[PDB]
Design a protein around this ligand. Sequence first.
Ligand SMILES: [Mg+2]
Ligand SMILES: [Zn+2]
Ligand SMILES: [Zn+2]
Lengths: 65, 193, 63, 131, 249, 96, 244, 99, 136, 100
Amino acid sequence: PQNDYIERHIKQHGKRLDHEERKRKREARESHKISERAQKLTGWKGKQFAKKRYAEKVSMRKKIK
Amino acid sequence: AREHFEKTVAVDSVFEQNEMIDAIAVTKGHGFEGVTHRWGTKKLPRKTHRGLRKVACIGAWHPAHVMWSVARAGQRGYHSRTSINHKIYRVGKGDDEANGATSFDRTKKTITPMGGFVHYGEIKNDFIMVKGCIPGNRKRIVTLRKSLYTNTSRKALEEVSLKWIDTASKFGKGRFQTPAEKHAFMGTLKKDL
Amino acid sequence: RDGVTIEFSTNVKDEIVLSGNSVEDVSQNAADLQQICRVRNKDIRKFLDGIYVSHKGFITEDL
Amino acid sequence: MGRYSVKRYKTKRRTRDLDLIYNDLSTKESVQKLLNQPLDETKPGLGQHYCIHCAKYMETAIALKTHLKGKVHKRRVKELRGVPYTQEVSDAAAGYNLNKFLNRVQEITQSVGPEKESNEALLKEHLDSTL
Amino acid sequence: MQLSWKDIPTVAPANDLLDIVLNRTQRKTPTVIRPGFKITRIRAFYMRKVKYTGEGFVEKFEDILKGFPNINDVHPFHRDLMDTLYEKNHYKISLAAISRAKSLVEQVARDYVRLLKFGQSLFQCKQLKRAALGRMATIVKKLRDPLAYLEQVRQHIGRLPSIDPNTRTLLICGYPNVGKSSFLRCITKSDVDVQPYAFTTKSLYVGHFDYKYLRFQAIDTPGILDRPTEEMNNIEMQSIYAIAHLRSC
Amino acid sequence: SHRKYEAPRHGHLGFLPRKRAASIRARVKAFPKDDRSKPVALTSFLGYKAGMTTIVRDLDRPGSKFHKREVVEAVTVVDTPPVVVVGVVGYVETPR
Amino acid sequence: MATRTQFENSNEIGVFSKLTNTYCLVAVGGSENFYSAFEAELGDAIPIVHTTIAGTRIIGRMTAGNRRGLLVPTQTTDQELQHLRNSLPDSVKIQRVEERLSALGNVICCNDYVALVHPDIDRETEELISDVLGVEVFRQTISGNILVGSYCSLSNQGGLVHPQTSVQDQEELSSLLQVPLVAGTVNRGSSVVGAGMVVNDYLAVTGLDTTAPELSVIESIFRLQDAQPESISGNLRDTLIETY
Amino acid sequence: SQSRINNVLNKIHVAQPQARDDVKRTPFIPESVKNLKKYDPEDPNRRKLARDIEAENGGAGVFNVNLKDKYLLEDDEWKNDIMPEILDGKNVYDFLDPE
Amino acid sequence: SGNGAQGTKFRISLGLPVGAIMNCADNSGARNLYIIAVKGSGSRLNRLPAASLGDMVMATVKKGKPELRKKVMPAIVVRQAKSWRRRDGVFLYFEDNAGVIANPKGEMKGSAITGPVGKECADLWPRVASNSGVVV
Amino acid sequence: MRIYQCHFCSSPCYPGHGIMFVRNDAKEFRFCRSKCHKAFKQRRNPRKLKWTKAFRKAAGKELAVDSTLTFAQRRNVPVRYNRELVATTLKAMARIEEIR
Ligand SMILES: [Mg+2]
Ligand SMILES: [Zn+2]
Ligand SMILES: [Zn+2]
């Protein structure tokens, strides 16, 4: 406390030992989980899922264009 | 057990003090019993038509049967019960006179209350003194396994020291432990002399 | 686990050394030891502590 | 057990315990303070008109002339004559602490008794001084 | 209350704030009726959603509008110092928008409740409910930009230090890179970066020490440049008002 | 309809059918396990209930507020003659 | 020698403890962190005794005494009372005393030399105490607070009263006890001082939440560190004026 | 302020005895306290501090203090004996005495 | 328990239920207290909250100083007169119903307590035990 | 244990029997049984009622003034526990009760 204490604490101690791969492997597992969830998640969360999923497809096509 | 044929077994050869045991017996038949005291249901208030000491609503249209969990009238008592974790306080040997005394008390006395027990005579054999309340009524037979497993909290560790045992009469309000005090504290009477 | 050896690292501080013939009987026995010191119900950015896999290697060294 | 002994003697509805009143009859300070008694809201005689033996407030002094010429108040004067039966009396009968029992018998004989007689002589005059 | 209002609950960006309440209505209230039911229950069904939705927007907003310490009439030290961080112009207008936003929702709620009792069909009343929540939704979609603002004040304000104006305080001034940092760590148990370039510290630092059994608090400053006082920086501006407001050596 | 005031069920459901017991002597359901390393031990025993008397004692329970302090409680007494052995029955584990 | 301690979380040290020049008494609840706190200070130099009174933990107020003797109420069991006489060496007289009033630590506050009492104590006790403790007896209230033990702490060096005490009270009352007297507080300003802390000729023990200004005040009057002969109230002028 | 300084001066200016008698009064401290060494917490070689005994058996909510073994007797043999406290009614403590 | 109570509250028989006037036993200036809420209570369908000795309650004043009236305030029961049990064997009960009033930490508003105080309450609250003249 | 005497029964009261009543004056009124405790509430007179011992001691019945009844002092000095004094007193109270 009393100012941005974490970013000081990072700048003396740093983020953990195993912070990189834990960051890295969740990105690696990510393309499985999205494909997993889209074949899971019944009952309107999928209906909430697909409309979110459709939005990133729209948005990427807008960026690429 | 080949050699123990026709041989008898003392009780203190099966347990000792400070042991959790557990008591099973049959419990105190009260015949055909009203629902309210059979189950603990709130009473309908007063002068309710067709009785007040029962349950009013008992079903709906569906299902069109009385369900099995609706607490009807019937038998209360005389059921086989299993009651665990009771603790042995005293294994006194009935051949030894002055069982009722301790190291603390040293007034030479039996465990037998004055007048004997109620609906029961006097302790002449060895006995087991256990706290709590065994399911079942007097003059009935009980059974004592031992704890089935290490059932051992720190409650089941502590080694008690009985400080004093009551042995006054229970047939009314007992007021003396031996007949010596009752012969003492009254003083000498008419039919004495 | 069976057939894995564990020694405390001399001459380099605060390190532990696990070694065996199986892959999985090491790595699971490695991973179980760092899942057991998990920090619970805290912020993980301020608290760093735990046991971590530092390095993967061979028992030969050199080839 | 029955209705009367309950609804007269509940723990809520309690009288005032003869020893305390016997202590009120002990010395002159308790005499004076139980005759002064400044004004209360709740007390029936607004504080005033308080008999001591019969621990009771009266509405008006007319009730006192009735009360002192009543068999009720004479039933209470005959009550407070002897040694007032404390726990000391109850246990010395069992043969326990006779030495404290002998002293208080001497003290009610010597000190308190005729003082309690003399205090009651004052209450006869000082209440007849009004009535 | 005073001094470093850490406990202002939280807030979400607007689409989630919408999504929270609507999913709270879909889960908490019942959800199954039929055309063939009695009309009174049908109106009683859709009334119950429109009411229960209406409080959810309100009670969250009431947690916000109770939350933030309402900059004016707080204390003139703190009152000025937050504007140097948060723009007392941009501050008040955001929260004033929310009370404008709240009161519209209760207004929308009470109308569509009042309209709903004259519904005659399932189909009519259903179309009123969707219309009711949509005009609620249009309000919250409108509210996007001030909500994202109040995220970042809330995370920042709990990380502010608390000073007391009245106590025995003392000020630590000097140029940047002077030696005022390492001094402060020497006088008190406090966590100050000591790096020898100029604008390292950008906010106030508070340490405590004791003398003659009395609580003292030290206050660090960032530093001032020459900079003829018309144009100055907000990082420098924090330095000034500490000297201005506070009773201190 | 949804009961408007939840309240826990009257009476335990576990003890059904609440009927008259089949004997005056309850059959022992489960004996303790059998460590085959120990010396030979008799696992249970039986007696006659005749009791409910009262014991004062001191409590040595470190942690409770009555530690090193006198506490009365009630005990039961069960009359206990010696018991004599007459028979031995073995049992065979079947898949039945 | 002002020492902060808690009883299990409690700052009310004087409730759970009785301390004289020659002995110390603690309750028996829970764990012996509290007993160890007096172990750390006193060494083995005085007997420190676990006890109960009526099986209750609150022994700093049921009892009263000094280094010469010690008094206990009527409700003391024979087990408890035998346990004390076994514990304490034979310079100490022990006696159960009977009254209406029960808690001696509220009725009586005292030292080795002069005892203050509640004004409505019976006369034979007032006879008895001067025989037991060998002290001077005075029927006296502190500022109208009728309890002398809760609302005052005593020593041979000095004494401490509740902060609502008038100077007019202190001036008279100090002439009775012949020690300097201080209007003071304790334990973040609890007005009851006798429940708050214990003190003797050479140790003072208070709660954790007794503030460091308050500690210095207690250290001043009871003169723990050598020497603080109240002249260092002349030093703490700048504190207490700024404090109050 | 000066509506404050009077209420503080109660706590500032102490009362004084005026010394009222020929009677001499001394604060008594036994020399056993005075000759006692201080307690180093980080000492190798110090008194055992019955915290530690309670832990070394042990633990907080588990350890049994012997209330005995620390009190004065003529011989250390009868530390562990049990007071009878009841011979046949009329209990003991009312009867025992010297002589 | 919650705040203030030191040690484990111990089982005794519940004397006073809600809506039971009891006396005011300190020197605060009230006469009677009107119990309306008992903290630490159970929750059971149609079962009344009830209190007993040494239980923190929420209550109001009927008779007394009007400044003290109009407002609920915390109180601790000190005399019960429904007979509870002492675990060292006896039952016992006082003459009446009374309690004294304090802050939720437990520091007394009243300076001194008239009447005797129950033992079992007295262990639980030291500020009660501070201002106590007669325990038991 | 203290084993008491009934305030109205004048009989001994074992623990776990009977009720103490506590006055506002806060002295202890124990009872052997509810027979006498109800008799206290109805406020009778044991010096007038026959069957308690307070009568029989006061009536000139069962003797009161005797040296064997002088040894039941409730003492207030707990002195010191020599174990050998206990060996005397256990033989003493056996001797005393015969003489009474
Ligand atoms: Mg910088
Ligand atoms: Zn009258
Ligand atoms: Zn009777």
